[PDB]
Amino acid sequence: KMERKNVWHHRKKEEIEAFSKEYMEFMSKAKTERMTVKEIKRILDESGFVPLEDFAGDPMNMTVYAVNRGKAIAAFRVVDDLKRGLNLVVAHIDSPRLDFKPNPLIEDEQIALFKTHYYGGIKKYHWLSIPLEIHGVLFKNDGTEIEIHIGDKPEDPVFTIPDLLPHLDKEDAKISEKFKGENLMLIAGTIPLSGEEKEAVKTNVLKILNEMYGITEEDFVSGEIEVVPAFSPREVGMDRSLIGAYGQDDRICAYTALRALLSANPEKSIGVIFFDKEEIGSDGNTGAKARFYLKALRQILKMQGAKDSEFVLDEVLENTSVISGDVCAAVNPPYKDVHDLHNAPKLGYGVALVKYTGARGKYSTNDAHAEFVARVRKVLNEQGVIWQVATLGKVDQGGGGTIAKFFAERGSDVIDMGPALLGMHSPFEISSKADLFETYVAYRSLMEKL
Amino acid sequence: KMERKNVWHHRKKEEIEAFSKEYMEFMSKAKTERMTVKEIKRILDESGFVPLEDFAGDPMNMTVYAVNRGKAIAAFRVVDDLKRGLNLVVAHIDSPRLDFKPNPLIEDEQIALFKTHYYGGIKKYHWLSIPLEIHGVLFKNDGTEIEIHIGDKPEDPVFTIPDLLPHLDKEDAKISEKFKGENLMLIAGTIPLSGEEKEAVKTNVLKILNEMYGITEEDFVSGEIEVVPAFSPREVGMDRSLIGAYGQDDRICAYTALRALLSANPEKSIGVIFFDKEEIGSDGNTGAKARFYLKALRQILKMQGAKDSEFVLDEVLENTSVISGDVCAAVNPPYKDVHDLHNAPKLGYGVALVKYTGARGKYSTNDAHAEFVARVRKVLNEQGVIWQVATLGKVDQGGGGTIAKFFAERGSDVIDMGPALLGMHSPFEISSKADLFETYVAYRSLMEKL
Amino acid sequence: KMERKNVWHHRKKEEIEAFSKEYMEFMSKAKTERMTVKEIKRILDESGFVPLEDFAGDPMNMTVYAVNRGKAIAAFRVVDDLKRGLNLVVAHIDSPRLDFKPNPLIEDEQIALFKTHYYGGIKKYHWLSIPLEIHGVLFKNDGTEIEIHIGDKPEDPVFTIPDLLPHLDKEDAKISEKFKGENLMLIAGTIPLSGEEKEAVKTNVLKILNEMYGITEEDFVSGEIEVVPAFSPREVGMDRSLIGAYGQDDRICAYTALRALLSANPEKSIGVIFFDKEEIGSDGNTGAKARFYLKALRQILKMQGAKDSEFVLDEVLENTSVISGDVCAAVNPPYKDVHDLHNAPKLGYGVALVKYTGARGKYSTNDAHAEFVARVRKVLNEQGVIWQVATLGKVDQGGGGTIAKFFAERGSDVIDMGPALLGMHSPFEISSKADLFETYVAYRSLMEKL
Amino acid sequence: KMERKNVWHHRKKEEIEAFSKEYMEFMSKAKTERMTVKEIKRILDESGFVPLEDFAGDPMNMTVYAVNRGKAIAAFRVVDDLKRGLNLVVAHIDSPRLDFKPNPLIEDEQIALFKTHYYGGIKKYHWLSIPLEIHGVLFKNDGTEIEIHIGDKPEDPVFTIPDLLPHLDKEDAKISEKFKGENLMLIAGTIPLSGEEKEAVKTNVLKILNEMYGITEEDFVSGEIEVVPAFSPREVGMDRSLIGAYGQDDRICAYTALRALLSANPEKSIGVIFFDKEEIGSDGNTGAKARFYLKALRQILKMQGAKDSEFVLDEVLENTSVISGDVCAAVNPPYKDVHDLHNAPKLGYGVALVKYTGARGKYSTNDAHAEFVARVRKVLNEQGVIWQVATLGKVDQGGGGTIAKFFAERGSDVIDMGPALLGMHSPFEISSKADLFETYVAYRSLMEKL
């Protein structure tokens, strides 16, 4: 008994392949959280969703969405009274990146550089000597919004933070020292602008930016630009069983959840909420823990006749099951020693059910209740969903931490659930096509029969 | 001339003893938060309490309780308009222990073992070579609930995590290294099944668990089992002045508070709330950071006719005095240099009044206001309660942190109060019978006089 | 070819179980070398034995015994003249423990304390924060003997050596440092006698001790009090195949040898000798090398007509096969590296036959001769006794040393043999019921057939 | 209320003083075991003792002595059937010193030096730059015996091992390094012989030793010379309360015992045995591990008509109480943290009753039984002897180990008793005049009352 089935042996190859190409197409547009919101919203508009604010026409049946500030977005399919509660799948759309500084442009030794400040649990050495592209937006003083996208197009140049050749790198310190956040600067120019006696190369770059976007240097301050890997999603492996791409840290869950939401046949209200800032603690007004979430829900309660928002919300949240959809780590052979094999997920064996994460003895982590796990286990088994238990490394390996805790905090039962990755947080995260497909299945089954 | 008074010299040996036996009897039942709740409930059911969800009586005079998820519980004796506030004593009913992994059963070197994942700030070396009890619940796929209690009965076997004999335990690492969470596995069985050629021993335990609970290996995933010391409460010392027992960390405060709640003659509404998860940060929907707390008060308010829950709450919490009932550290002679003797509690000298905890200089902790302490100082003195001021060690020694900050965060004045233990977080914590009693006396008078 | 059999597959579950209940009854009586001698003495008395000191019958068929100083005891069943030598199995009845110092009572920080001095190879951290009980004897200045047994009964208070709470335990030292033998003091009392200007608590404890035993502080000098863990023997495991108890380190070999002595049907004289002082190197009056052993044999020889004691003895010992009892170490999965699996004993695979108890290349050990092992191997095999070979860990892992050498030194052939333990020297040692039984089965065979 | 009594307040200053001068006079003679024996003999010859080999008197009333090899001696006052046992006090007459190598004379940098090989646990740095005496015997090939005593007479020169002046003694190593045995060489001479062209200085010393003792260089091989401090016994302190002297380590016990043997009025046979070699393990035919001890008793037994020596011995040793007379360590104020003040002896507070020594928890040491201590406690108290309990430092501090275990090994009950020194093993050990006296008083009463 107690054996894990391999998805490739219980699901249609063609179905997996198809769903796989749709995912990667999406991962081609979703490099930042602003692009993911944009890309999700249009998929919603395309599927007949309308802004919750603009909705008119009977609650008890309304498919709407609420965009936070371009950084977060919540989509619901209200099918009944919210006091009946709902099935939610929460995920995050921010991934480790680089981020320009308020004053990014500088020149050092006749070379224009863009200074950055890493974001999230990055691994410095991953971002040295690889083709990067930049995305983001800048506002002119008058308030004109300027979008930037350089590197995603073949006629576009890419950027780079060149490593030091090994011939003159005569000094090996701990991975800690060596690789300083400050030296993560993209080369921006090198060509001096004839006639300038002070920082000719920097000036020239500003000249190009001004002729190209009508922007001036002070416009970087009132703007945000993210540096990401130019690698495009690709199939991986001789058997083409895996997917390689940047930002799979939850965009893989966001995508699957989105899809599950669009094909589900609910019984009670359902929805998905994609948050930002999770990679740095979920602070700010666009991450989990922000009033945003309960505000969207309160808005609905009023349209449904709720007299006392907060009181009614108590039942809404009392009922309502939340699936914290985030990723975990798959046993990586050369480093199998970091896991407890009897509780570590394997690529291809299905969605991982992660009861508790955290660190040093379940510190600051949400631990799902046996009653909830039971209810989740029953729906999955009845729907023939293929899943596997998943722990975040041997007892004291570390890591741990999702957004699930911020939801149990509001009174709802939550459980972490998603596919296992390889090389998480790197510029090219690996995932299994089959698991990617089964997560979608799982989320849909839970949204429906939970 | 300010000096501390010894409770034994001011309270009647026979009343302390009676209270001790009642406490120890309670402690023989409350070994986990689930068992504690169930035990606190039957005591509440007697005494005449009814669920808040099934009240239907006079909203101005109700003695009710709310059970979160079998892991937390709130009990109030509402005898006025809650707008006038409550007098609440709060504590936690969870203690450092060992939890079974989702997949706990494995076999190694022909021996069945149950893997664990320690919960809370335990001292790993305490759990090696001591009798252990298994407690918890398992859910079979169909939904069936199965309670497990093994080792707490004379006709029951116990479990152990045998340490390595000193003869081959060469090489002495720091306490950090040595003693690794991963190695905290209980021996499940050693007898192999006849005919079985693959894990004959693990197969046997499964055969046994099945002929006993009708469960299969996978039921552990949708289960929550906790390992606890087989030690039962006992008197300690030649003068029988102390109590040795597992989980005194707050269940001692929970008991004294519960008792004070039942004995009190309150002028205003009083109540006690017992939380889960504090030993890991209070995260989770059963922690003192979850909606549950304010959910219950809002519930009571509507029954009293509140029209705008939130607004009415601002006042309820504005008034209302919360007593954070948690234990502090008494001076352990051999390690007395860890304390500031002029600000450290002593066994037998009364309840400890703990103004602020935290570390490195009041970091992340509630620091009682001088005026709130003043009100407390006056009640205790007026009723002749034996108390003493306590601190959690010398300035930069260690780090405390109770749930007090979670209620102060909600607008109420809060202070930490409880008995002083010796060997906190170990399998056999020590407390003073005299302090036990006086804590109850303190909680009751504060409930009635604040 | 060549494979160990599991005793559970070749022995009646009813026999093993019953013999186990009896051994456990015994272990709840033998917690110190004195109580063990006392216990063994009555089992002998009830079985027909009488003191060698006052035997009268035929010196060719005598079943006597000789207690040394209430700490050691030799029991023989002379069935022929000792010149034919006899078959003996020797074990030790002392176990690592804590001893009260001559002046054990002191007070510090208003806490009565009992200073100890550990005995044998204990792991100091094992004794912190666990229930303890004291057993021993004190003599008044007039010669009166006072027995002390506090903690072995429920009504009795138990003692403890509270560890420091993790919160304030800062310095991360290595096992060597930290856990100072000096800090292993039991808490004596905390209540202060009113009216006492100095050391009020200590006076109260002496006041309690004097009303209970009429003793005075000086009576501890002419006394011997041992500190033993409070917990009693319990079955262990889901399959209940193991036994957990303090002092299994040879009280187990002594018990099985005893029972084997009573039910054996000898062909030549046989006997069992239980020694003291083994955990410290067998020094003193009651040790394995304390003259007591040969004094008993000479006595018996003289009762048989021995003219030149020492000369005759030369032959008595020339013949005479000695089986050194004592336990060995089983493989503890998480620490299996410590062992050479091909030469290490497994729990439940029979009596361990240890040829030598090395230490860095067999220093100071009794390596049994091939021809003597062959003799033993023939008997065990022919009698169908299940056994396995066992070495005390990998080559330079650690030390070892049974009393066997003290007997080979006297001219006899010796060989180490007993069951395999887990967590040796801890307060809760683990052993297999099956092995417990086969050791008894093995001793009985060898006595009857060597 | 238990408290120690100060001998100076209970024994008569004039009797202590008289005893002190007699002791110090003895100590001026006994500087080595060979000199001590010779000195103990003439005192025994007076007082009326005769060699055991030349007795020929009443076997039931003999006061004899046995000299081992001029290095050990036994003296008994047999006044009954030895079967009734003896009351023996044992001590050693050897002390830490420096021995001449077999070939001790060498020359280096034009200076004759005598190489040495330290004996016993000395502190090398004590022997640098202090006056030294040379004592011992040399045998010329023909067999002639030549006693050497140089430095103990005013008209004698002394020797020295000059340390390096601090000015060039750069580099500070641990006490281990620095101070090397090999470098403990006494300056023999510095004057060169006229005409000599090879080692003119070593040649001179040889010429001198020859015109003085008629010896040649090779006679040192068949010789045994010991280097000893030139310091002579002296009163110490303003109150003249102490005694400073070399070799107090036991010669203080040997003296007090000898004196008690001569003063006593015994009920049963009493005696004292003085051993050699204890300072290195008691190995050798003059140590307390050699046949000598039992050889003498067997001798006495035959004279009493014993037919079977060994058998009769079992009883002799069965009865017979042995007092291990050796010194313990008094608290040295500046280094008082090395002791457990509640169990450490103090100068002037009587003989120390030392139950067990050894290290790491009673390893390799005799641990007196409670009943034996009881008998001792009673005699001392009954005769009003001032005594105190002593321990050799805190639990894991150091390591003791007296010859007590060698007699307990032979069947007799044994306990350690002696005065408390300060600076043991140094060239000038300190003892208390009051303790000196009281030791003698204790030994005598025990001899007469046990």
Ligand SMILES: [Mn+2]
């Ligand atoms: Mn991440």
Ligand SMILES: [Mn+2]
């Ligand atoms: Mn994530």
Ligand SMILES: [Mn+2]
């Ligand atoms: Mn705690």
Ligand SMILES: [Mn+2]
């Ligand atoms: Mn607590």
Ligand SMILES: [Mn+2]
């Ligand atoms: Mn042992």
Ligand SMILES: [Mn+2]
């Ligand atoms: Mn042993």
Ligand SMILES: [Mn+2]
């Ligand atoms: Mn010495």
Ligand SMILES: [Mn+2]
């Ligand atoms: Mn000595």
